[PDB]
């Protein structure tokens, strides 16, 4: 289909676009034959990425390249993408499935996603000029691992006392380890857009590859960093299991995983309360996780302490 | 970057989009270590596809997923994409390279491309209501194989008396067989847009997967087909070499390969001459290759005859 910006109600739009992939999270989907929500990871990654620029997602396309797959696997992938597009509030405008046995072994596939969004010229983000020392960092809860760090995840599972089919560790639901690890990326595009539209968000960072350390600097003025404290948010228990199993340092955790924070907003102190109110009303979970500070550029205090499980508590 | 439709000069745009891939043409690039023009295949595929809807390409994004690659291979891929975008006249707005050793063996990569275009509401194609029996089919020359049929190509080379490093067969240039097979897809977006903008093109089909037989019906009214005659265009010699080596039937050739025709236009008889004049002035090559007829939906007369090399002619 062709997209009609006028019918969509834009007066003077700028267009944002981005491409993303699920990474080796797909290998776990393929190992466990659990493909229903991998389309949500793909769509969420693309729409959350353009949300960061201040854009409302308009439409999405995927390129689905694969070895020989079961009919039921091909269908489950594609249906989950359609489902995720409905959830995000964007149109599935096209796609391609390209079967290439010489490129991929039986049962393996890759996904590339593309999303296009739009906003008014004045609705654009970040507003770098507005960001100052003492500004507040708001963290939005992730659903878990989202779609990054899965090369490390798969290495840890491979040497662990648990298999993907094992019960998920203490405090990770009545599901298998595979189910837990496959928990789909949260879509923030529909719930957080009115919050961005308030005009009191100075910047938005979607937390993806490179974790908290790599993604936050991209939306800060050159001379500023951020001081974060991990005691101020809830760390999903999957991150504790992983740290313990792989004996992971703070740095490794902060560079690889979202650690519970799927997205960050920069807001002034004065505007903090109404932002938190706005987020809560749109059914997301959020905390003040730190502050913008003079100038490591991002510091994550108390990460291991905050996620380490007390061995005398059952 | 963000795209500014206003600055670009659109009054009332519709947006066209599409995703495409190079297919197993990439395997030949990887086998021969010849990656300089694979980016042109990718970009050409995406821009020629939106050209078909009547759109001017605005911008392009790629997702580049790979095993461990040489630094020089990664760079050559990416530079060829940048180069192709300049040629097509569209902006390279973004991209991602995702190295995943567990997904791809050393030296193997895949490409997904995404292009967005725009045109006026009245500049849209096809104009299905306008197409009638007796309308003319204009064929635009391909540069060769373009980017489809490469699973069959690689099978034929694998059993042939020629290797990719062998001299290219009689009448295929002073280059290797690999060089010939890698000849990049022609970009039609910059040269053929003014022709589409004339308002005398009823429809455009880019000839890709499924060849002449699959791609032309998509732009015809339900009750109409097309009668083509292969004696009316030049068939590049690569197609003769392939037919002979694989002992390929007319049907196999017409369903797999473009056979010399990279794109088709539907035009009225009255408007034929000025269209041919328009194409020639924009430095493309074209012929009247057939006509729209009542209702196999697409017929390709004289394909093997027209491409068979006379054995008594040296």
Coordinates of C-alpha atoms in Angstrom, one line a residue:
Chain A
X1 CA 0.0 0.0 0.0
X2 CA 0.8 3.7 -0.3
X3 CA 0.7 5.9 2.8
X4 CA -1.5 9.1 2.7
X5 CA 0.0 11.6 5.2
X6 CA -2.9 14.0 4.6
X7 CA -5.6 11.5 5.5
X8 CA -3.4 10.7 8.5
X9 CA -3.8 14.4 9.6
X10 CA -0.2 15.8 9.3
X11 CA 0.1 19.5 8.5
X12 CA 3.9 19.8 8.1
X13 CA 5.5 16.4 8.8
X14 CA 9.1 15.4 9.1
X15 CA 9.7 11.7 8.5
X16 CA 11.8 9.5 10.8
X17 CA 13.0 6.0 9.8
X18 CA 15.0 3.1 11.2
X19 CA 15.9 -0.4 10.6
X20 CA 16.5 -3.1 13.3
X21 CA 16.8 -6.8 13.9
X22 CA 16.1 -9.2 16.7
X23 CA 19.7 -10.5 16.9
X24 CA 20.5 -14.0 18.2
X25 CA 17.3 -14.0 20.2
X26 CA 16.0 -15.8 17.0
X27 CA 18.3 -18.7 17.7
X28 CA 16.4 -19.4 21.0
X29 CA 13.1 -19.1 19.2
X30 CA 14.5 -21.6 16.6
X31 CA 15.9 -24.0 19.3
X32 CA 12.7 -24.1 21.4
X33 CA 10.3 -23.9 18.4
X34 CA 8.6 -20.8 20.0
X35 CA 8.1 -18.2 17.3
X36 CA 4.8 -16.5 18.2
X37 CA 6.3 -13.4 19.8
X38 CA 9.5 -12.9 17.8
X39 CA 7.5 -10.6 15.5
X40 CA 6.8 -8.4 18.5
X41 CA 10.5 -8.1 19.3
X42 CA 11.1 -7.0 15.7
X43 CA 8.3 -4.5 15.5
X44 CA 9.0 -3.1 19.0
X45 CA 12.7 -2.6 18.2
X46 CA 11.8 -0.5 15.1
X47 CA 8.9 1.5 16.5
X48 CA 10.7 2.3 19.9
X49 CA 13.7 3.5 17.8
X50 CA 11.7 6.1 15.9
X51 CA 9.7 7.1 19.0
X52 CA 13.1 8.3 20.2
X53 CA 13.2 11.0 17.5
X54 CA 9.7 12.1 18.5
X55 CA 7.9 10.3 15.7
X56 CA 4.5 8.5 15.7
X57 CA 5.0 5.2 13.8
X58 CA 3.0 5.1 10.6
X59 CA 4.0 1.9 8.9
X60 CA 6.3 -1.1 9.0
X61 CA 7.9 -3.5 6.5
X62 CA 9.9 -6.7 7.2
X63 CA 12.4 -8.8 5.2
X64 CA 12.2 -12.4 6.3
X65 CA 15.1 -14.5 5.0
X66 CA 15.2 -18.2 5.7
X67 CA 16.4 -21.7 5.1
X68 CA 13.7 -24.5 4.7
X69 CA 11.2 -23.9 7.5
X70 CA 8.2 -25.8 8.7
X71 CA 5.0 -24.3 7.3
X72 CA 3.8 -23.8 10.9
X73 CA 7.0 -21.8 11.8
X74 CA 6.8 -19.5 8.7
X75 CA 3.1 -18.7 9.6
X76 CA 3.8 -18.1 13.3
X77 CA 6.6 -15.6 12.5
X78 CA 4.4 -13.7 10.1
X79 CA 1.3 -13.7 12.3
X80 CA 3.3 -12.3 15.3
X81 CA 4.6 -9.5 13.1
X82 CA 0.9 -8.6 12.1
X83 CA -0.1 -8.9 15.7
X84 CA 2.7 -6.6 16.9
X85 CA 1.8 -4.0 14.2
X86 CA -1.8 -3.8 15.5
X87 CA -0.5 -3.4 19.1
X88 CA 2.0 -0.6 18.1
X89 CA -0.8 1.1 16.2
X90 CA 1.0 1.1 12.9
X91 CA 0.2 -0.4 9.5
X92 CA 1.9 -3.5 8.1
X93 CA 2.6 -2.1 4.6
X94 CA 4.6 -4.9 3.1
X95 CA 7.1 -7.6 3.5
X96 CA 9.1 -10.2 1.8
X97 CA 9.9 -13.8 2.7
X98 CA 12.9 -15.1 0.8
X99 CA 13.7 -18.8 1.1
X100 CA 17.4 -19.5 0.4
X101 CA 18.6 -23.0 1.5
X102 CA 22.2 -22.2 0.4
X103 CA 22.3 -19.3 2.8
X104 CA 20.7 -20.8 5.9
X105 CA 20.6 -24.3 7.4
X106 CA 17.1 -26.0 7.9
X107 CA 15.1 -24.2 10.6
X108 CA 17.2 -21.0 10.6
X109 CA 15.9 -17.6 9.5
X110 CA 16.8 -13.9 9.9
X111 CA 14.6 -10.9 10.3
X112 CA 15.1 -7.2 9.2
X113 CA 12.5 -4.7 10.1
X114 CA 11.9 -1.1 8.8
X115 CA 9.5 1.4 10.3
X116 CA 8.6 5.0 9.2
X117 CA 7.1 7.6 11.4
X118 CA 6.2 11.3 11.3
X119 CA 5.8 14.3 13.6
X120 CA 5.4 18.0 13.3
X121 CA 8.5 20.1 12.7
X122 CA 8.2 21.4 16.4
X123 CA 7.4 17.9 17.8
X124 CA 11.0 16.7 17.0
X125 CA 13.4 15.2 19.7
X126 CA 16.0 15.5 21.3
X127 CA 16.1 19.1 22.3
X128 CA 19.8 19.1 23.2
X129 CA 19.9 22.9 23.9
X130 CA 17.4 22.4 26.7
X131 CA 19.4 19.8 28.6
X132 CA 21.4 21.0 31.7
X133 CA 23.2 19.7 34.8
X134 CA 20.6 18.8 37.5
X135 CA 18.0 17.5 34.9
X136 CA 16.3 14.3 35.9
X137 CA 16.7 10.9 34.3
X138 CA 13.4 8.9 34.2
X139 CA 13.7 5.1 33.6
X140 CA 10.8 3.1 32.0
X141 CA 10.6 -0.6 32.9
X142 CA 11.5 -3.2 30.3
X143 CA 9.7 -6.6 30.2
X144 CA 13.0 -8.3 30.6
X145 CA 16.0 -8.9 28.2
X146 CA 14.1 -7.3 25.2
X147 CA 16.3 -8.1 22.2
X148 CA 19.9 -7.4 23.1
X149 CA 22.6 -9.4 24.8
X150 CA 21.5 -12.8 23.5
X151 CA 24.9 -14.0 22.3
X152 CA 26.0 -13.8 26.0
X153 CA 22.6 -15.3 27.1
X154 CA 23.0 -18.3 24.8
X155 CA 26.6 -18.8 26.0
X156 CA 25.6 -18.8 29.6
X157 CA 22.6 -21.2 29.1
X158 CA 25.0 -23.6 27.2
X159 CA 27.2 -24.0 30.2
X160 CA 24.5 -23.8 32.9
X161 CA 22.8 -26.4 35.0
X162 CA 19.6 -25.4 33.3
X163 CA 18.4 -26.1 29.7
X164 CA 15.8 -24.0 27.8
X165 CA 13.2 -26.7 28.7
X166 CA 14.0 -26.6 32.5
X167 CA 11.6 -24.8 34.9
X168 CA 12.5 -21.0 34.9
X169 CA 14.7 -20.1 38.0
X170 CA 13.1 -19.0 41.3
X171 CA 10.9 -15.9 40.8
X172 CA 10.7 -16.0 37.0
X173 CA 7.1 -17.4 36.6
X174 CA 5.5 -20.8 36.0
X175 CA 7.2 -21.2 32.6
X176 CA 10.4 -22.7 31.1
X177 CA 13.7 -20.9 30.9
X178 CA 13.2 -20.7 27.1
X179 CA 9.8 -18.9 27.7
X180 CA 11.4 -16.5 30.1
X181 CA 14.3 -15.7 27.8
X182 CA 11.8 -15.2 24.9
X183 CA 9.6 -12.7 26.8
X184 CA 8.9 -10.1 24.0
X185 CA 10.3 -6.6 24.0
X186 CA 7.8 -4.0 25.3
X187 CA 6.3 -1.7 22.7
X188 CA 6.4 1.9 24.0
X189 CA 5.1 3.7 20.9
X190 CA 1.4 3.7 21.7
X191 CA 1.6 4.3 25.5
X192 CA 4.5 6.9 25.6
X193 CA 3.8 9.1 22.6
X194 CA 1.2 11.3 24.5
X195 CA 3.9 11.8 27.2
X196 CA 6.5 12.9 24.5
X197 CA 3.7 15.1 23.0
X198 CA 3.4 17.0 26.4
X199 CA 6.4 19.0 25.3
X200 CA 8.2 18.4 28.6
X201 CA 10.5 15.6 27.4
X202 CA 13.9 16.9 26.5
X203 CA 15.1 13.6 25.1
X204 CA 14.3 9.8 24.8
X205 CA 16.7 6.9 24.4
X206 CA 15.6 3.4 23.6
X207 CA 18.0 1.0 25.5
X208 CA 19.3 -1.5 23.0
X209 CA 22.8 -2.8 21.9
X210 CA 25.4 -1.6 24.3
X211 CA 22.9 -1.2 27.1
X212 CA 22.7 1.8 29.4
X213 CA 26.3 2.8 28.8
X214 CA 26.1 3.1 25.0
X215 CA 22.5 4.4 24.4
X216 CA 22.2 7.3 26.9
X217 CA 25.2 9.4 25.7
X218 CA 23.6 9.7 22.2
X219 CA 20.9 12.0 23.6
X220 CA 23.0 14.1 26.0
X221 CA 25.0 17.3 25.2
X222 CA 28.7 16.6 24.7
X223 CA 29.8 18.0 28.0
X224 CA 27.2 16.1 30.1
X225 CA 26.9 12.6 31.5
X226 CA 24.5 10.8 33.7
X227 CA 24.8 9.3 37.3
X228 CA 22.4 6.4 37.7
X229 CA 21.6 4.3 40.8
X230 CA 20.3 0.8 40.3
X231 CA 18.5 0.8 43.7
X232 CA 16.0 3.2 42.3
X233 CA 14.4 0.7 39.9
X234 CA 13.3 -2.9 39.9
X235 CA 15.7 -5.3 38.2
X236 CA 13.8 -8.3 36.7
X237 CA 15.1 -11.6 38.2
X238 CA 16.3 -12.9 34.8
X239 CA 19.2 -10.4 35.2
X240 CA 20.2 -11.8 38.6
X241 CA 20.1 -15.4 37.2
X242 CA 22.4 -14.3 34.4
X243 CA 24.9 -12.3 36.5
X244 CA 25.2 -15.3 38.9
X245 CA 25.5 -18.0 36.3
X246 CA 28.1 -16.1 34.2
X247 CA 29.8 -14.3 37.1
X248 CA 29.3 -11.0 35.3
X249 CA 30.8 -7.7 36.4
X250 CA 28.9 -4.5 36.8
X251 CA 30.5 -3.2 33.6
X252 CA 29.6 -6.3 31.6
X253 CA 26.0 -6.2 32.8
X254 CA 25.7 -2.4 32.1
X255 CA 27.3 -2.6 28.6
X256 CA 25.2 -5.7 27.5
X257 CA 21.8 -5.6 29.1
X258 CA 19.0 -3.1 29.8
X259 CA 19.0 -4.3 33.4
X260 CA 15.3 -3.4 33.8
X261 CA 15.3 0.0 32.0
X262 CA 13.9 -0.3 28.4
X263 CA 14.0 3.4 27.8
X264 CA 15.1 6.7 29.4
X265 CA 13.6 10.3 29.4
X266 CA 15.5 13.5 30.3
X267 CA 13.2 15.9 32.1
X268 CA 13.6 19.0 34.3
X269 CA 13.1 18.6 38.1
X270 CA 10.0 20.9 37.9
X271 CA 8.4 18.7 35.3
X272 CA 9.3 15.3 36.9
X273 CA 6.1 14.7 38.9
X274 CA 3.7 15.3 36.0
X275 CA 5.8 13.2 33.7
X276 CA 5.7 10.3 36.2
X277 CA 1.9 10.9 36.5
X278 CA 1.6 10.8 32.7
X279 CA 3.6 7.5 32.4
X280 CA 1.5 5.8 35.2
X281 CA -1.8 6.8 33.5
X282 CA -0.6 5.2 30.2
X283 CA 0.0 2.0 32.1
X284 CA 3.8 2.0 32.0
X285 CA 6.1 1.7 35.1
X286 CA 8.8 4.3 35.7
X287 CA 11.2 5.7 38.3
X288 CA 13.5 8.6 38.7
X289 CA 16.8 6.6 38.2
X290 CA 19.3 9.4 38.2
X291 CA 20.4 12.8 37.0
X292 CA 22.3 14.8 34.4
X293 CA 25.7 15.7 35.7
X294 CA 28.9 17.4 34.5
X295 CA 31.8 15.2 33.1
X296 CA 33.0 7.1 32.5
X297 CA 30.2 9.2 30.9
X298 CA 27.4 7.0 32.3
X299 CA 27.8 5.7 35.8
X300 CA 25.6 2.8 37.1
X301 CA 26.0 2.7 40.9
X302 CA 25.0 -0.4 43.0
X303 CA 24.1 -2.6 40.0
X304 CA 25.5 -6.0 41.3
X305 CA 24.5 -5.1 45.0
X306 CA 21.0 -4.2 43.9
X307 CA 20.5 -7.4 41.8
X308 CA 22.4 -10.0 44.0
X309 CA 20.0 -12.5 45.6
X310 CA 20.5 -13.0 49.4
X311 CA 21.4 -16.6 50.0
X312 CA 19.8 -16.8 53.4
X313 CA 16.4 -15.7 52.0
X314 CA 14.1 -18.4 50.6
Chain B
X1 CA 18.5 11.8 9.6
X2 CA 14.9 13.0 9.3
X3 CA 13.4 13.6 5.9
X4 CA 11.8 17.0 5.1
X5 CA 9.1 16.5 2.5
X6 CA 8.5 20.3 2.3
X7 CA 12.1 21.2 1.6
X8 CA 11.9 18.4 -1.0
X9 CA 9.1 20.3 -2.7
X10 CA 6.1 18.0 -2.4
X11 CA 2.7 19.7 -2.2
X12 CA 0.4 16.7 -1.5
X13 CA 2.6 13.5 -1.4
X14 CA 1.7 9.9 -1.2
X15 CA 4.4 7.7 0.2
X16 CA 5.5 4.4 -1.5
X17 CA 7.8 1.9 0.2
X18 CA 9.3 -1.5 -0.4
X19 CA 11.9 -3.9 0.9
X20 CA 14.1 -6.1 -1.2
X21 CA 17.1 -8.4 -1.1
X22 CA 19.9 -9.4 -3.5
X23 CA 19.1 -13.2 -3.1
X24 CA 21.9 -15.8 -3.7
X25 CA 23.7 -13.4 -6.0
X26 CA 25.6 -12.6 -2.7
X27 CA 26.9 -16.2 -2.6
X28 CA 28.8 -15.5 -5.9
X29 CA 30.1 -12.2 -4.5
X30 CA 31.3 -14.1 -1.4
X31 CA 32.9 -17.0 -3.5
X32 CA 34.8 -14.6 -5.8
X33 CA 35.6 -12.0 -3.1
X34 CA 33.9 -9.3 -5.4
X35 CA 31.7 -7.1 -3.3
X36 CA 32.1 -3.6 -4.9
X37 CA 28.7 -3.6 -6.8
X38 CA 26.5 -5.8 -4.6
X39 CA 25.3 -2.6 -3.0
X40 CA 24.1 -1.4 -6.4
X41 CA 22.0 -4.6 -6.8
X42 CA 20.4 -4.0 -3.4
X43 CA 19.7 -0.3 -4.0
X44 CA 18.5 -0.8 -7.6
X45 CA 16.1 -3.6 -6.5
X46 CA 14.5 -1.3 -3.9
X47 CA 14.3 1.9 -6.0
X48 CA 13.1 0.2 -9.2
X49 CA 10.4 -1.4 -7.1
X50 CA 9.0 1.9 -5.9
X51 CA 9.5 3.6 -9.3
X52 CA 6.8 1.0 -10.4
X53 CA 4.2 2.8 -8.2
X54 CA 5.1 6.1 -9.7
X55 CA 7.3 7.3 -6.9
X56 CA 10.5 9.3 -6.8
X57 CA 12.9 7.6 -4.4
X58 CA 13.7 9.8 -1.4
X59 CA 15.8 7.7 0.9
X60 CA 17.2 4.2 1.6
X61 CA 18.2 2.1 4.6
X62 CA 19.9 -1.3 4.7
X63 CA 20.2 -4.1 7.3
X64 CA 23.5 -5.9 6.8
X65 CA 23.7 -9.1 8.8
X66 CA 26.9 -11.1 8.8
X67 CA 29.3 -13.8 10.0
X68 CA 32.9 -12.8 10.7
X69 CA 34.0 -10.9 7.5
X70 CA 37.2 -9.4 6.4
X71 CA 37.5 -5.6 7.2
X72 CA 38.0 -5.1 3.5
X73 CA 34.7 -7.0 2.6
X74 CA 32.6 -5.1 5.2
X75 CA 33.9 -1.8 3.8
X76 CA 33.4 -2.7 0.1
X77 CA 29.8 -3.7 0.7
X78 CA 29.0 -0.5 2.5
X79 CA 30.8 1.8 0.1
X80 CA 28.9 0.2 -2.9
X81 CA 25.6 0.9 -1.2
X82 CA 26.6 4.6 -0.6
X83 CA 27.7 4.7 -4.3
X84 CA 24.5 3.3 -5.6
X85 CA 22.4 5.7 -3.5
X86 CA 24.3 8.7 -5.1
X87 CA 23.6 7.1 -8.6
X88 CA 19.9 6.6 -7.9
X89 CA 19.6 10.1 -6.6
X90 CA 18.4 9.1 -3.1
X91 CA 19.7 9.7 0.4
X92 CA 21.3 7.0 2.4
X93 CA 19.5 7.7 5.7
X94 CA 20.6 4.9 7.8
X95 CA 21.7 1.3 8.2
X96 CA 22.8 -1.4 10.5
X97 CA 25.6 -3.9 10.4
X98 CA 24.9 -6.8 12.7
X99 CA 27.7 -9.3 13.2
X100 CA 26.3 -12.7 14.4
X101 CA 28.8 -15.6 14.1
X102 CA 26.2 -18.1 15.4
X103 CA 23.9 -17.2 12.6
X104 CA 26.3 -17.1 9.6
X105 CA 29.5 -19.0 8.7
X106 CA 32.8 -17.0 8.2
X107 CA 32.6 -14.9 5.0
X108 CA 28.8 -15.1 4.6
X109 CA 26.4 -12.2 5.0
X110 CA 22.9 -11.2 4.0
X111 CA 21.4 -7.8 2.9
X112 CA 17.9 -6.3 3.3
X113 CA 17.2 -3.0 1.7
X114 CA 14.3 -0.5 2.3
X115 CA 13.5 2.5 0.2
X116 CA 10.8 5.2 0.6
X117 CA 9.5 7.4 -2.2
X118 CA 6.9 10.0 -2.9
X119 CA 4.8 11.4 -5.7
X120 CA 1.7 13.6 -6.1
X121 CA -1.7 12.0 -5.6
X122 CA -2.3 12.3 -9.4
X123 CA 1.2 11.0 -10.3
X124 CA 0.4 7.5 -8.9
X125 CA 0.8 4.3 -11.0
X126 CA -0.7 1.9 -12.4
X127 CA -3.8 3.4 -14.1
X128 CA -5.6 0.1 -14.5
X129 CA -8.8 1.8 -15.9
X130 CA -6.8 3.1 -18.8
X131 CA -5.4 -0.2 -20.0
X132 CA -7.1 -1.8 -23.0
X133 CA -6.6 -4.6 -25.6
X134 CA -4.2 -3.3 -28.3
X135 CA -2.1 -1.2 -25.9
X136 CA 1.6 -1.5 -26.4
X137 CA 4.2 -3.2 -24.2
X138 CA 7.6 -1.4 -24.2
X139 CA 10.6 -3.4 -22.8
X140 CA 13.6 -1.6 -21.2
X141 CA 16.9 -3.4 -21.4
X142 CA 18.4 -5.0 -18.4
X143 CA 22.2 -5.1 -17.8
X144 CA 22.1 -8.9 -17.6
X145 CA 20.8 -11.2 -14.8
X146 CA 20.1 -8.3 -12.4
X147 CA 19.4 -10.0 -9.0
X148 CA 17.1 -12.9 -9.7
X149 CA 17.5 -16.6 -10.8
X150 CA 20.8 -17.0 -8.9
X151 CA 20.0 -20.3 -7.3
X152 CA 19.7 -21.8 -10.8
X153 CA 22.8 -19.8 -12.0
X154 CA 25.0 -21.3 -9.1
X155 CA 23.6 -24.8 -9.8
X156 CA 24.5 -24.5 -13.5
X157 CA 28.1 -23.1 -12.9
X158 CA 28.7 -26.0 -10.3
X159 CA 28.2 -28.6 -13.0
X160 CA 29.7 -26.6 -16.0
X161 CA 33.0 -26.8 -17.7
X162 CA 33.6 -23.2 -16.5
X163 CA 34.5 -22.0 -13.1
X164 CA 33.8 -18.4 -11.8
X165 CA 37.5 -17.7 -12.5
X166 CA 37.4 -18.9 -16.1
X167 CA 37.3 -16.5 -19.0
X168 CA 33.6 -15.4 -19.6
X169 CA 32.1 -17.3 -22.5
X170 CA 32.3 -16.1 -26.2
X171 CA 30.7 -12.6 -26.5
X172 CA 30.5 -11.8 -22.7
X173 CA 33.4 -9.3 -22.4
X174 CA 37.1 -9.5 -21.4
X175 CA 36.3 -10.5 -17.8
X176 CA 35.8 -13.7 -15.8
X177 CA 32.5 -15.7 -15.6
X178 CA 32.2 -14.4 -12.0
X179 CA 32.5 -10.7 -13.2
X180 CA 29.8 -11.4 -15.9
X181 CA 27.4 -13.0 -13.4
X182 CA 28.0 -10.2 -10.9
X183 CA 27.1 -7.4 -13.5
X184 CA 25.1 -5.0 -11.2
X185 CA 21.3 -4.5 -11.7
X186 CA 20.5 -1.3 -13.7
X187 CA 19.1 1.6 -11.7
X188 CA 16.0 3.0 -13.6
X189 CA 14.9 5.5 -11.0
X190 CA 16.8 8.5 -12.2
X191 CA 16.6 8.0 -15.9
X192 CA 13.0 6.7 -16.3
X193 CA 11.1 9.0 -13.8
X194 CA 10.7 11.9 -16.3
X195 CA 9.2 9.3 -18.7
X196 CA 6.7 8.2 -16.0
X197 CA 6.1 11.9 -15.3
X198 CA 4.9 12.5 -18.9
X199 CA 1.6 11.1 -17.9
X200 CA 1.5 8.7 -20.8
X201 CA 2.7 5.6 -19.0
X202 CA -0.4 3.5 -17.9
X203 CA 1.8 1.0 -15.9
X204 CA 5.4 0.0 -15.0
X205 CA 6.6 -3.5 -13.9
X206 CA 10.1 -4.1 -12.6
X207 CA 11.1 -7.6 -13.7
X208 CA 12.3 -9.5 -10.7
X209 CA 11.5 -12.9 -9.1
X210 CA 9.4 -15.1 -11.3
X211 CA 10.6 -13.2 -14.4
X212 CA 8.4 -12.0 -17.3
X213 CA 5.6 -14.4 -16.4
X214 CA 5.1 -13.4 -12.8
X215 CA 5.7 -9.6 -12.8
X216 CA 3.7 -8.4 -15.8
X217 CA 0.2 -9.7 -14.7
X218 CA 0.5 -7.6 -11.5
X219 CA 0.0 -4.4 -13.5
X220 CA -2.7 -5.6 -16.0
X221 CA -6.5 -5.6 -15.6
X222 CA -7.8 -9.0 -14.6
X223 CA -9.2 -9.8 -18.0
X224 CA -6.1 -8.9 -20.0
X225 CA -2.8 -10.7 -20.8
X226 CA 0.3 -9.9 -22.8
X227 CA 1.7 -11.4 -26.0
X228 CA 5.5 -10.9 -26.2
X229 CA 7.9 -11.8 -29.0
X230 CA 11.6 -12.3 -28.0
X231 CA 12.8 -11.4 -31.5
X232 CA 11.9 -7.8 -30.8
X233 CA 14.6 -7.3 -28.1
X234 CA 18.3 -8.0 -27.6
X235 CA 18.9 -11.0 -25.3
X236 CA 22.3 -10.6 -23.5
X237 CA 24.6 -13.5 -24.2
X238 CA 24.7 -14.6 -20.5
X239 CA 21.2 -15.9 -21.1
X240 CA 22.2 -18.0 -24.1
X241 CA 25.2 -19.5 -22.1
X242 CA 22.8 -20.5 -19.3
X243 CA 20.1 -22.0 -21.5
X244 CA 22.7 -24.1 -23.3
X245 CA 24.5 -25.2 -20.2
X246 CA 21.4 -26.2 -18.2
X247 CA 19.3 -27.3 -21.2
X248 CA 16.6 -24.9 -20.1
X249 CA 13.1 -24.8 -21.6
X250 CA 11.3 -21.6 -22.7
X251 CA 9.1 -21.8 -19.6
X252 CA 12.0 -22.2 -17.2
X253 CA 13.9 -19.2 -18.9
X254 CA 10.7 -17.0 -18.8
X255 CA 9.8 -17.9 -15.2
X256 CA 13.3 -17.4 -13.8
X257 CA 15.2 -14.8 -15.8
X258 CA 14.5 -11.3 -17.1
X259 CA 15.9 -12.5 -20.4
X260 CA 17.1 -8.9 -21.4
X261 CA 14.0 -7.0 -20.2
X262 CA 14.6 -5.4 -16.8
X263 CA 11.3 -3.4 -16.8
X264 CA 8.1 -3.1 -18.9
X265 CA 5.8 -0.1 -19.7
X266 CA 2.2 -0.3 -20.9
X267 CA 1.4 2.6 -23.3
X268 CA -1.2 3.3 -26.0
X269 CA -0.2 2.9 -29.7
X270 CA -0.6 6.7 -30.3
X271 CA 1.9 7.5 -27.4
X272 CA 4.4 4.8 -28.3
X273 CA 6.8 6.8 -30.5
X274 CA 7.2 9.7 -28.0
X275 CA 7.7 7.3 -25.2
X276 CA 10.5 5.5 -27.1
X277 CA 12.0 9.0 -27.9
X278 CA 11.8 9.9 -24.2
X279 CA 13.5 6.7 -23.1
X280 CA 16.4 7.1 -25.7
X281 CA 17.0 10.7 -24.6
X282 CA 17.4 9.5 -21.0
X283 CA 20.1 7.0 -22.2
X284 CA 18.1 3.8 -21.7
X285 CA 17.5 1.2 -24.4
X286 CA 14.0 0.0 -25.3
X287 CA 11.8 -1.8 -27.8
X288 CA 8.2 -2.4 -28.5
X289 CA 8.2 -6.1 -27.3
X290 CA 4.5 -6.9 -27.6
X291 CA 0.9 -5.9 -26.9
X292 CA -2.0 -6.2 -24.4
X293 CA -4.4 -8.8 -25.6
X294 CA -7.6 -10.6 -24.3
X295 CA -7.4 -13.8 -22.3
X296 CA -1.1 -18.7 -20.2
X297 CA -1.6 -15.0 -19.3
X298 CA 1.9 -13.9 -20.5
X299 CA 3.1 -15.5 -23.7
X300 CA 6.8 -15.3 -24.7
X301 CA 7.1 -16.4 -28.3
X302 CA 10.4 -17.4 -29.9
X303 CA 12.5 -17.2 -26.7
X304 CA 14.8 -20.2 -27.2
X305 CA 14.9 -19.6 -31.1
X306 CA 15.9 -16.0 -30.5
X307 CA 18.7 -16.8 -27.9
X308 CA 20.1 -20.0 -29.4
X309 CA 23.6 -19.5 -30.9
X310 CA 24.1 -20.9 -34.4
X311 CA 26.9 -23.5 -34.2
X312 CA 28.2 -22.8 -37.7
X313 CA 28.8 -19.1 -36.9
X314 CA 32.2 -18.2 -35.3

